[PDB]
Amino acid sequence: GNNVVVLGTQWGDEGKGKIVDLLTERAKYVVRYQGGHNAGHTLVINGEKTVLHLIPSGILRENVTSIIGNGVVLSPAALMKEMKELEDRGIPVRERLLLSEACPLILDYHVALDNAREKARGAKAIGTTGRGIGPAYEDKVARRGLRVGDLFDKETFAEKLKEVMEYHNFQLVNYYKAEAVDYQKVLDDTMAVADILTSMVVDVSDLLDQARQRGDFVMFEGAQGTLLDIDHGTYPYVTSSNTTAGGVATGSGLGPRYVDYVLGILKAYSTRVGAGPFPTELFDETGEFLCKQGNEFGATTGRRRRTGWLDTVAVRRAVQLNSLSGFCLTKLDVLDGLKEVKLCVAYRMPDGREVTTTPLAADDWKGVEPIYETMPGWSESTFGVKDRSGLPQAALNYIKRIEELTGVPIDIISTGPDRTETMILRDPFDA
């Protein structure tokens, strides 16, 4: 179909960046619809590495116009940082990036608050990325937050900012006993780049409506993952935006009836960064092996990611929540050499029940134990393989099994971090 959504079906870091960069070869637009610079992606073209955060993963292609929808919480500082980085490398961001006037702005006091609140929580700290996402979403929802559209009137923005900062500073110093964040500093920093920012502003809703009528291939790119969703994730150990497919319409302005194919990025094993339930988490040698072989360290905070087996019970939650059309299995190559691979097929509740559905809030996950199916692993190298025939039968079985257990076809298989090390069995666009 024309409108294809690409999002994470686990806890983020499944390989969205690469897959979006690969697939956008036929796309006209690429849209970020939620999150902020909390995300981190690594694209790799012929060995050249690119780490993105706020900017969409279709920025390396000139034929594509990258858009960051209203659902995104925009950090002026963060954007500029990535802009210069990409520009010095020959990628003209200003020319291929459009942004929404509705996008809320992430200013310094948000990071201060984020750190403050995270400290206050103490032992039950969420383990947030420390980029001010939560507080940004908060001001938005409260209706006191600033959006890109405010910047258009430098006078009143300065005024509006003045009061909001008084507001936050009061609690920052009084309640949290933390240092105040200087207004003038925020005003100067922000004013220093306003003209650049405002130049990329477009009416993205109306635009996507127009693109739709023309039949333009559009790709929506999700940040984070399903189980990190504000409503449906392992609350409160989640991010403050709807990471699920429903965030596409709220976060871009496109009517929900116009989603043709939701491609779910599924990693061959699981990882999670930050606090929260993780039924299949491995603390043993295999965990170390997985972490090591998959270079599992957060591309935004550098933090070592928690690792574990693929959880089909949890993945099945992503299926229904996102209305998955197909899966893209990433990192199959990381399992090379394992004597055996296991996939969680059911949960054993703390009261004795065997269930194949997921608990909601984090608390209700507390004594939940995983029930596995153990399949033989494979010694053969699958790295860089671009054809199923190069895959050992075990790997093929592992693949068939996942499809069986989920009811969703694995339409794409990734065998390496490079754009070309992939197998496209069915293209979301012409399917």
Ligand SMILES: Nc1nc2c(ncn2[C@@H]2O[C@H](COP(=O)(O)OP(=O)(O)O)[C@@H](O)[C@H]2O)c(=O)[nH]1
């Ligand atoms: N071995 C291997 N590495 C991969 C593959 N796909 C992606 N990677 C790398 O694995 C990581 C995926 O994590 P991350 O970048 O945070 O994913 P994202 O946030 O969903 O875009 C990145 O460092 C990629 O460069 C794959 O198929 N195999």
Ligand SMILES: O=c1[nH]cnc2c1ncn2[C@@H]1O[C@H](COP(=O)(O)O)[C@@H](O)[C@H]1O
């Ligand atoms: O892009 C991401 N990838 C993986 N984990 C993330 C990402 N963004 C946030 N998190 C996690 O989401 C939770 C809340 O963090 P926040 O979004 O920084 O406020 C923490 O568990 C973070 O580690």
Ligand SMILES: O=CN(O)CC(=O)O
């Ligand atoms: O790509 C995002 N990271 O893995 C999150 C982090 O660095 O905490």
Ligand SMILES: [Mg+2]
């Ligand atoms: Mg990431």
